[PDB]
């Protein structure tokens, strides 16, 4: 299911004359783009009826696990879009199951239990982190779940903190995520594109590099870190009420930020030289991380909790060329306020 066909080649896109790149939206385009974005954001927001279904699934799973394997304090947690304020009604339910009972990390044992109790399309992937995928026919929800993936819970908590800092982040990130789904550039497993978490990091990194910045570098704000419930200091600043309002110095609207996001990644950002690091909040070079030797390093996005891992390693040179075309395609359409055409649903050739 290769998203970017090998026929694209690997050539770098041309450097367009800077005078031919639109510098800012016109007054009419921004006003219409602003209303079109807030109308779409209202459609993208989740509904209460589906929110209670996701909580019913969590409770149903937690009862099934504790009744089948009692005495192990098995708890079910939401993470990803389900826990960072960025999910929609059609989003999957991403679940992290925790227990001190290490035997539960054999996930096909979980797959058998859920299939035995009526779940459908039950597949286990025993893989980076083992995953059980189900489809709940009663609640009409798809669910991916892993066991003791505490890293996913922490960086979900980091994304949620970033979303809580500035009220423009949630609508901006949800609209961009919607764009990644419509263009089908959010499949790092089979399509060769970028993961949902990779895109969120690219959004945060863009917001950190604005002048003035919309978001801070939470990993570097040492004086704003709280003691977690395990007794350890949080790796990132998480004092949300004290962090709120950090981006108020930036006066750009939602419409301008969407325009600048695509403009940044279409023409401004030098993909060949720099690594995007939301951990540092500044640009790093590939050379200072020795990342000029990484295979699939055309796009370097540093994972904040493991600076030795490039989130963009799922994109080869052909996939990156197609990804760069989509970002330039998006920039040209948003520069004219064409939000609907920017989000045209991609369809795979037969
Ligand atoms: Mg403040």
From TrEMBL:
Residues 33-163 form the Poly(A) RNA polymerase mitochondrial-like central palm domain. Disulfide bonds join 108-124. Ca(2+) binds at residues 92, 94. Mg(2+) 2 binds at residue 297. Mg(2+) 1 binds at residue 94. Residues 253-307 form the PAP-associated domain. Belongs to the DNA polymerase type-B-like family. This is polynucleotide adenylyltransferase.
